[PDB]
Amino acid sequence: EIRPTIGQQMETGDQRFGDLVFRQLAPNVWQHTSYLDMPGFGAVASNGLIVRDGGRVLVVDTAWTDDQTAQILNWIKQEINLPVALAVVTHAHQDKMGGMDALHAAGIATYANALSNQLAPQEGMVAAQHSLTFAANGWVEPATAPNFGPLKVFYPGPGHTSDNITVGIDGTDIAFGGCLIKDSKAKSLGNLGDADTEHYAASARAFGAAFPKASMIVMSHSAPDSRAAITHTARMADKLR
Numbered sequence: 001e002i003r004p005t006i007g008q009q010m011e012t013g014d015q016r017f018g019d020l021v022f023r024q025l026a027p028n029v030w031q032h033t034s035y036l037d038m039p040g041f042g043a044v045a046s047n048g049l050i051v052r053d054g055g056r057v058l059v060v061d062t063a064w065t066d067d068q069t070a071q072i073l074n075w076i077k078q079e080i081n082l083p084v085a086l087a088v089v090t091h092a093h094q095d096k097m098g099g100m101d102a103l104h105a106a107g108i109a110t111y112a113n114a115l116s117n118q119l120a121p122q123e124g125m126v127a128a129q130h131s132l133t134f135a136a137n138g139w140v141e142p143a144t145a146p147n148f149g150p151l152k153v154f155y156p157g158p159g160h161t162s163d164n165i166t167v168g169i170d171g172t173d174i175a176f177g178g179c180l181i182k183d184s185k186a187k188s189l190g191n192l193g194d195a196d197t198e199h200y201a202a203s204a205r206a207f208g209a210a211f212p213k214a215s216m217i218v219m220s221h222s223a224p225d226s227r228a229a230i231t232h233t234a235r236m237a238d239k240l241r
């Protein structure tokens, strides 16, 4: 069993598939979890989402590597058996974009914040094929999110990184905060090296206000939590200013 140093442990209802873990959150929504070993530190988990929308599947975030991301696609083939229409990635760090080549090799259309695509080369990432842009209130410009179906993309402002984006799943109680939101038991906001400490708290609060009725908050490095994760994150970030 994989017992990560960062991220949730394995729980009943989880399915191991290769070195990845999959957990159903709702009839048409699953969380994907992949792991990276950090020397002297142990395993670090990263979570993303898989959404069944009619006759197609939509993915939020890659795994850490191409090989792990290919296994996401294999799991989808086995357990859902519908084509993957698109993937959205939520910022230009390895846990979210490290597997872009596996998606492109498979012919899957990929989307990221334009700024994420602009930063990807510097971050050692392969840029997505398409760029999302955002209104002043943070909501995606819909022409840049073609056929996103239930994925409702929101840019909350700079926080974890300047490019971080978030995704609500329409028709469910689920919203995905990515690496911006930490669970309510977190002791810190983690590594702040790329973070905007001035704007982080407001960005976290903006995420909460954008998806006011989501009751299950999914995040990159913790198990799903209640809305308290948002407020606790924002109050930790208040201390950075």
Ligand SMILES: CCOC(=O)[C@]1(CS)N[C@H](C(=O)O)C(C)(C)S1
Pocket: 006, 044, 093, 094, 095, 179, 190, 191, 221
């Ligand atoms: C290059 C590996 O690092 C990463 O890709 C992340 C991106 S969020 N960095 C975080 C950090 O260093 O705190 C993390 C929680 C370990 S995962």
Ligand SMILES: [Zn+2]
Pocket: 091, 093, 160, 161, 179
């Ligand atoms: Zn990150």
Ligand SMILES: [Zn+2]
Pocket: 046, 093, 095, 179, 220, 221
């Ligand atoms: Zn992360």
